[PDB]
Copies of this chain bind each other. A is one copy, B any other.
């Protein structure tokens, strides 16, 4: 076996022996830590089977004179340039260790208050919440599987964000999770913005499929999908949304459900949907889905900017003084939006299985915010069925997840999902044809 030593991290705190003992190869905690560290070294598909290709990989944590040193057994050779691990990948290994450790030390210490304080704590522990920072963070969302035209577009938006001294917070992995940071690197250099921040959020059951690029200079591993959604919207000062598949619709329905709450009517966070000229049909269909399901009231919470990278960035840049003023109006923090009201329906972690998917309430007779929360979960289930080990396994055992609801809505969701399949948004190129993991059915007398 090839054994490689990773020297201590710039800025990783000393750990105690109690903090790290749960990580020995011995609880499934080691396997989870190993699997996240493997994903960071393996930064070329979304169906987990490279976790059969690195079976002999393992990682050992050593407490030493300057803090933690890591020993890697048989690491991916693509983490190397000229025999050395890329420094940004080195920093990600330490980020993985830090967050796994932190969460495991605070699994002990209402529940809605608990979840928000836990999200705040993880982010604060990661160094992601800079107290003195003026608002400038744009969350970017978009598909992992996008064409070259969409990809170049996300790169040019990132350039435009860079020229305006804005920072980027996004998911991890290929497609729209990687383009803007590459564009921002150039626009930040032109503008001499050396304090740039490219935050990449992930969680343990999706990191292998959507692994962090080395350019991400603040990686944070959140415990689950809902906590990462809540981290995105409490840190965001503005949000740009590119074309994407089910994961990107999920995010859109999460934020629109929150923003329709009357207590959030004065939250100024700008939301811009944007894409190249060729995405015009895609946005017409999305805009129509949203206002047909959630009503015409949802329209006030976002705008659409087609084929104009500088417009999206300018709308974000121009809103930063509005964000500043609103935070001071609420006696809130610039770096973490505590005053944003997030109802428990957006926090409750959702575990996609046949029963939970069939339990979803997709009828028109609810508050729109609540229909949004249920649609968020439906799209979360399609993602899971497609890419999470445990969700793919449910689909293997029992076939597709079945959903039902108002027939008009179900038809519209079924068409949206078929469009995602026709636009190749479900699967990166070069597997076999995509087989849907979902089936829309009509809602179903006793024997006596």
User: Is A243 an interface residue, CB under 8 A from the partner?
Assistant: no
A163-B83 Cα distance, complex, nearest whole Å: 12
Distance from A238 Cβ to chain B, minimum over Cβ atoms (Å): 15
Interface residue? A104 (CB, 8 A)? no
* Pair A182/B191 contact, Cβ less than 8 Å: no
For A277, the chain B residues whose CB sits under 8 A away are none
State whether B189 touches A215 (Cβ < 8 A): yes
Q: Are the C-beta atoms of B215 and A86 separated by less than 8 Å?
A: no
Q: Which of B88, B108, B131, B196 is within 8 Å of A14, CB to CB?
A: B131
A 190-217 binary contact with B (CB < 8 Å = 1; else 0):
1110101010000000000000011101
A67 at interface, CB cutoff 8 A: yes
Complex formed: what's the CA distance from A67 to B333 in Å? Answer: 6
- Complex interface residues of chain A between 88 and 115 (CB less than 8 A to chain B): 88, 91, 108-109, 113
**How many residues of A are counted as interface, with CB atoms below 8 angstroms from the partner's CB atoms?**
60
- Once the chains bind, are B67 and A131 in contact (CB under 8 Å)? yes
Q: Which residues of B contact A213 (CB under 8 A)?
A: 190
- Interface-facing stretch out of A298-306, A334-342, A367-375: A334-342
Give the shortest distance, in Å, between A10 (CB) and chain B (any CB).
Answer: 8
Closest to A12 in B: B131
Least CB distance, A312 to chain B, in whole angstroms:
13
Contact of A13 among B63, B124, B163, B334 (CB under 8 A): B124
- Chain B residues closer than 8 Å to A133, beta-carbon distance: 66
B residues near A185, Cβ cutoff 8 Å: 185-186, 188-189
Residues of A within 8 A of B (CB): 8, 12-14, 16-18, 62-67, 81-82, 86-88, 91, 108-109, 113, 117, 120-121, 124, 129, 131-133, 163-164, 181-182, 185-186, 188-192, 194, 196, 198, 213-215, 217, 314, 317, 324, 327-328, 331-336, 338
